[PDB]
Structure formats: structure tokens, C-alpha cells
């Protein structure tokens, strides 16, 4: 039910991303999609990722998109087009993807049908793992810098490439 | 059949050709009787049992039905008397058919033939010989090819193997059907779960055929200018083909319901055509230039 609400908000906001005539409006709806995603992450208990999605996707990436799109001052004539003639091609491609890809987990991960019986009493509690609980943050930090440090450093190389490319392609020094 | 359906599509039955249509209906009745009694003559299983049921049809009459059946038989059962009298009738009826056809032709030449436009045609008529002579000759040769295909390569496909078994008055065959050209009437007969009702429906078929030309209709003949009647024509053709197919089926589900609905549709054609004429009388006053 709550996942129905968040998924409905995400569906509408994403349609607005892909269908809003004004690109500034598209960037703003994109920001709504990331907020809803963060809500889902909070439902999963991943509060670090929930906050980081706000900090990075909304706080940095969407800001970059907004700065660029706002200064472009795009006129609608340059990017307008009628989409009524795409309904069939989207219908097949969407349906095929819908029929295959929304139900891919069904055969492997069969849902438990909720019965008219209190199964909550069959939840077994192991207190041993509860003496010293780890946050999402410290569980991730136990791994990033020691056992998988090479991937961490390669990501640093990727960011360095981004910095160099941004300078070389756009810089015009006064 | 092709002839009767040309007449139905172009409304060739309408005034002034009503007598032509009525003589044609009489001819159709004569053809049916002739072909049936002819089919009795080989004296196979089909012959004997079909003769049994058709002569029994007269028993639908309450008071004198049995006496008519026994008078038709010449006895208490279908036997040699039935076959001998059926032979005489079979020699005779073809000659009456010839006379009826001549009368049909004379009635048609009172006013001349109708045409595919359904309009008055006196301004563009041509002599029969040679134009329609050579056209009918093309038709005659094509029919000869068709008939020859049937005669030489598929001589028994339009028939049932049961009639190659000599007639056995003891055992009725598990499947007992008339020739294909009688099957629609068979279906209409069996769609009524009542003796007298079935015979009355068979008579009502020819009553409707005879009453067709006298319906107060619109003044437009050809289906070429009557979209609704044209569609009803192609539905009636489908319904008749369905009745023929149903007549070949055993009397059991789902074919009883299908036969009943098909018989209803067949009678609805003749019930609805007069309504169509009455309503379409107002077309020239409602579709103004």
C-alpha cells in the first residue's frame, strides 16, 4: 500500500520527466523521482543510501542539469514534436518489456500469499546478532577501503577523467 | 439454387413479375418431389428409409393422416407397391416440369427480364440471338466442364455409401439423411420438436416464398442500391448454407440450438423485408438534394 503510493508517485513523476514540454520542468520532476527513490530506500533500512541519493543525485547532479538547462534557454520549437504517432511502437515495446520484465522474478521468487492467520508469531528472534548492531554506514565502510580498495581507486580515476574532460572541452580562460 | 438467389438479390420477384416467381415456386416443388421419388428407385437403404419418413409426413394430420399414409404406401408398410407407383410418378412429373417451365418462360416474356440495375430497360434492349446466345454458350461450356469433373473423377462424392447397400426393412442405418439439396428443409423440419409443427414449418417455407412478391415494398428493386436489403441477402445466404450443413449432423447438442436459431433467421428474412419496404418508401422524402 505504501509501496503502491510511492510507486504511483514515481510513475507519474517519471512520465513528467519524459513528457514535459519545458526541460527545466523535466529536471524538477527528475528531482521528485529521486525523492521517492529515497523513500523506498528508507523502507529498505538503507538510510545511508537514502541520504546519499539526496546529496549526490539531487544536491549535485540535478543542480548541474538545472544550471545547464536554465542557461540554455531552449525554445520549444527546437524540441517540440507530436507523440500521438508513437503510441503503437511504445505499446508493443512497452508490453513486451512489461510481460517479460515485471514478472521475471515470479518463477524464481514466488510470493508468499498473505493468509487469514497470524504468521507473525512464527518470526524467530536471535538476540546474538542484536548485542552490537552495525549501521548501514559502518557495514559499508568496513569493506570499501580494505577488501575492495582497488575498485574504490578505479572510481577515483573515473572522477579524475571527468575533471580533466570538463576542463579540456569547455574552458575559455579570460 | 443460383437462379433463385439471383432472383432474390435483384428482387426479380417484384411487380410486374409476381406470376413468374409464383410459377417458379411451383416448379421448385415439382423438382423436389421428382428428385425424391427418383432417389427411391435404386432401392438402397437410403431409398427405403427416406421413403418411409416422407410418406409418414402425412400422419401429422390428426384425423385422416394415417389413412393418407397407408394410401400413399399402398399397404401397411413401404413395399413393392410404393416402388412401382413411385416409378410411374417419376416418368410423369418431368413432363409436367417441362410444361411448367414453358409457362414460366411465357410469364417472363410478358414483361421481359429484369436487369442488374433494376431500372426500366426499354431504351437499351438488344436481340437474344446472337448476343445472349453466345453468352449462354460460354455458360453452357463452363457448366459442361464442371459436370464432367463430377461425372468422371468424383462420381460418388455427392452421395452417401449407404445406398450401395440393398434395402433392409429390419435395420435403420445409424445415419439417415436425404440428398444434399434437401438438407436445409431437413434442418427446418428437425428444428421443431413437434411432428405437426415441423410439417407446418415446411409448408410455411413455401408459403413465405409465395407471399414474397405481394408484400407492399419500396419501388427500388436491385440490392445494388439497397444497402440494408443487400446485407440481409448475404446473411440469408449464410443462414441457408448453415441449415444445409446442420441437416447433415446428428440430432444432438449443440446442433439443435443452432438449427433452431438458423430456422428463426431464415423466417426473419421474409418477416423483415416488408418492414424494410414500408420504411424505405420514405427515403426519397428524407434524402434531399
Amino acid at each position: 500500500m505504501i509501496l503502491s503510493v510511492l510507486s504511483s508517485l514515481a510513475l507519474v513523476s517519471g512520465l513528467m520527466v519524459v513528457r514535459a514540454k519545458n526541460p527545466v520542468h523535466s529536471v524538477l520532476f527528475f528531482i521528485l523521482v529521486f525523492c521517492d527513490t529515497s523513500g523506498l530506500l528508507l523502507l529498505l533500512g538503507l538510510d545511508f543510501f537514502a541520504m546519499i541519493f539526496l546529496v549526490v543525485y539531487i544536491g549535485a547532479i540535478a543542480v548541474l542539469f538545472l544550471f545547464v538547462v536554465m542557461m540554455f534557454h531552449i525554445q520549444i520549437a527546437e524540441i517540440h514534436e507530436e507523440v500521438l504517432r508513437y503510441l503503437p511502437v511504445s505499446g508493443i515495446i512497452g508490453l513486451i518489456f512489461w510481460w517479460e520484465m515485471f514478472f521475471i522474478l515470479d518463477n524464481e521468487s514466488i510470493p508468499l500469499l498473505p493468509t487469514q492467520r497470524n504468521t507473525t508469531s512464527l518470526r524467530y528472534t536471535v538476540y546474538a546478532g542484536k548485542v552490537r548492531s552495525w549501521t548501514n554506514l559502518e557495514t559499508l565502510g568496513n569493506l570499501l577501503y580494505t577488501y575492495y580498495f582497488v575498485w574504490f581507486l578505479v572510481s577515483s580515476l573515473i572522477l579524475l577523467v571527468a575533471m580533466i574532460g570538463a576542463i579540456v572541452l569547455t574552458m575559455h580562460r579570460t | 439454387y443460383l437462379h433463385i438467389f439471383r432472383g432474390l438479390y435483384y428482387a426479380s420477384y417484384s411487380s410486374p413479375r409476381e406470376f413468374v416467381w409464383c410459377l417458379g415456386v411451383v416448379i421448385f416443388l415439382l423438382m423436389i418431389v421428382t428428385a425424391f421419388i427418383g432417389y427411391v428407385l435404386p432401392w438402397g437403404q437410403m431409398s427405403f428409409w427416406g421413403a418411409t419418413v416422407i410418406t409418414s409426413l402425412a400422419s401429422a394430420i390428426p384425423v385422416v393422416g394415417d389413412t393418407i399414409v397407408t394410401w400413399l404406401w399402398g399397404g401397411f408398410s413401404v413395399d413393392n407397391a410404393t416402388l412401382n407407383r413411385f416409378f410411374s410418378l417419376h416418368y410423369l412429373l418431368p413432363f409436367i416440369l417441362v410444361g411448367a417451365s414453358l409457362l414460366h418462360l411465357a410469364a417472363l416474356h410478358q414483361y421481359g427480364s429484369n436487369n442488374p440495375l433494376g431500372v426500366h430497360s426499354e431504351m437499351d434492349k438488344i436481340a437474344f440471338y446472337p448476343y445472349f446466345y453466345v453468352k449462354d454458350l460460354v455458360g453452357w461450356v463452363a457448366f459442361a466442364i464442371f459436370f464432367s469433373i463430377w461425372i468422371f473423377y468424383a462420381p460418388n462424392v455427392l452421395g452417401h455409401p449407404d445406398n450401395y447397400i440393398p434395402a433392409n426393412p429390419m435395420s435403420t442405418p445409424p445415419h439417415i439423411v436425404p440428398e444434399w439439396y434437401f438438407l436445409p428443409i431437413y434442418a427446418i423440419l428437425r428444428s421443431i420438436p413437434d411432428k405437426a409443427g415441423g410439417v407446418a414449418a415446411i409448408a410455411l417455407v413455401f408459403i413465405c416464398l409465395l407471399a414474397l412478391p405481394f408484400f407492399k415494398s419500396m419501388y427500388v428493386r436491385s440490392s445494388s442500391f439497397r444497402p440494408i436489403y443487400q446485407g440481409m441477402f448475404w446473411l440469408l445466404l449464410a443462414d441457408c448454407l448453415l441449415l444445409g450443413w446442420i441437416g447433415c449432423q446428428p440430432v444432438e447438442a449443440p446442433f439443435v440450438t443452432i438449427g433452431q436459431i438458423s430456422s428463426l433467421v431464415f423466417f426473419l428474412f421474409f418477416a423483415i423485408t416488408p418492414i424494410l419496404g414500408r420504411v424505405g418508401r420514405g427515403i426519397p422524402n428524407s434524402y434531399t438534394d
Binding site: 527528475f30 543510501f49 510470493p111 | -
Partner: protein
């Protein structure tokens, strides 16, 4: 039913990105935005699976994929900027000279 609901959420985001590619033939900025939507959907797929499987590998890779998404958007928007600067317009008819 939790896992099928979490997966179909990410799945609708991915399908929306695909549709945004399909519906935006004159708007390549939205095409870039649709690609980000697909990347977000994949990131969500890794996080959901990590919880469902009780395994940390999905979480490490999710963080690294966020780094890749950031660098991708930076470089892509730089290329958009220079294309616009050369042409003075972002219309697709001015980026179709290479062909055949």
C-alpha cells in the same frame, strides 16, 4: 509480496527511461535524462537484491555506480555545451551531418 513490489518499482523507472528514449526524437537532453533514469533503476536493483540476499556486494557496487553516473553526467553535459556553442542551437537537424 515485498520483493516483487520493490522490483516492479525499479522496473517502471527503467521502462520510463526506455520510453523517454523512444518519445524524445527532437529532444536529446531528455534522452540523456532518460539514460540517467535507467541508471537509477539499476542502482535500485542492486540495493533491493543486497537486502533480499543478505549480501553486501550489491551495496559496494551501488556506491561505485553512483560515481560512474556522476562522471557520465558531467562529461555528457560538457559535450552538450560544446555542441550548442558550435551550432547556437540544440535542434537535432544540426547534428545530422555525419551519415552514410
Amino acid at each position: 509480496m515485498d520483493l516483487i513490489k520493490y522490483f516492479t518499482f525499479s522496473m517502471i523507472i527503467f521502462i520510463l527511461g526506455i520510453w523517454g528514449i523512444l518519445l524524445n526524437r527532437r529532444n536529446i537532453l531528455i534522452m540523456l535524462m532518460s539514460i540517467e533514469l535507467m541508471l537509477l533503476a539499476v542502482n535500485l536493483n542492486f540495493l533491493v537484491f543486497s537486502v533480499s540476499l543478505d549480501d553486501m556486494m550489491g551495496q559496494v557496487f551501488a556506491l561505485l555506480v553512483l560515481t560512474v553516473a556522476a562522471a557520465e553526467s558531467a562529461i555528457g553535459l560538457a559535450i552538450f555545451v560544446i555542441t550548442f556553442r558550435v551550432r547556437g542551437t540544440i535542434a537535432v537537424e544540426f547534428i545530422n551531418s555525419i551519415q552514410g
